[PDB]
Amino acid sequence: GDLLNL
Amino acid sequence: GDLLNLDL
Amino acid sequence: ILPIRFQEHLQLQNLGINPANIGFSTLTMESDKFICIREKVGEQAQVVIIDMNDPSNPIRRPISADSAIMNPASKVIALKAGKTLQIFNIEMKSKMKAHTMTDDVTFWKWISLNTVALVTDNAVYHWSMEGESQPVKMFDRHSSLAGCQIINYRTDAKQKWLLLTGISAQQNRVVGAMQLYSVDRKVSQPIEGHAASFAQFKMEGNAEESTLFCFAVRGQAGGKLHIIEVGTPPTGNQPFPKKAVDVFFPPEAQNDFPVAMQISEKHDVVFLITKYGYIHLYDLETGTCIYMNRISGETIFVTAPHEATAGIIGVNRKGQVLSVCVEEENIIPYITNVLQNPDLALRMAVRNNLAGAEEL
Structure with a gap:
């Protein structure tokens, strides 16, 4: 994901 | 008018 | 011995509050200093303001x-009717601000001592009480929250990371939809989640504090709690290693989900409360689950930080006002003897200067 990699 | 009725 | 302490503060029905007005749309608790309740008595609508330091008057x-929301620290109340917003200082008996928005404000709250957040169907705004400040648009809402009931809005300490949360029914369960927004990047990410908080945390060896985002979700496959650094670490810092841990729901609570989170930066612990009154405590650093239990029969619908103990305070559907915090003389022996985790006990003892790991 753009902001965070979960 | 006012959304609260102030005491005085 | 338990690692937490439960306390009852008040019963709102004993102050003449009608039980029908004890719920999410009529009772607000923006901090531990005040509770505000809207009641209709005859044809006349009224607000009841309870000072938590002098509750019997x-x-x-x-x-x-x-809608009525009191400032976190002062007797300054914000009121709205559709698009019309007004702010009053009660002690000064005066109208301090007025503003009329383009769209109806469907949800609002105080996000600091001097700033109110406003949510419409289309966007989110911040409004400072300083000087002649007007509401400023922060971001446009993402389509994944369309038709949701909005339940919360939160930010990090620096107001650079913003988080909107809504819920709805899908496939016979309560699904949460969050929008995370970076002010500096001007980018959003949609995330499945039910309850969250930001926190500042200074890792061993780092000169600067880390900004962490913590969220809990009950997804199609089970509960999870995530703890993740937002953005690139302050210059010279190690990155915080991200954690993802299970959140347990018993077999007989098939419809329960997370409704509230508060993080104690005194003890570096996360308090999680569920719709049906289960309380969980996790370590912020590792994500280790320290304790769980059912503490309310009635549903809890609003919470705040409890300043005096760095715990959590909340109100249930009956009008019980209750708090939970860390029991400082018990938590370290509990972790050592009942959880049988001497590593965690030793770490928490030295990290937060708690007594009890002299014998493991």
């Missing part, structure tokens, strides 16, 4: 508003 005043 509440003020009742006439209003014409659909």
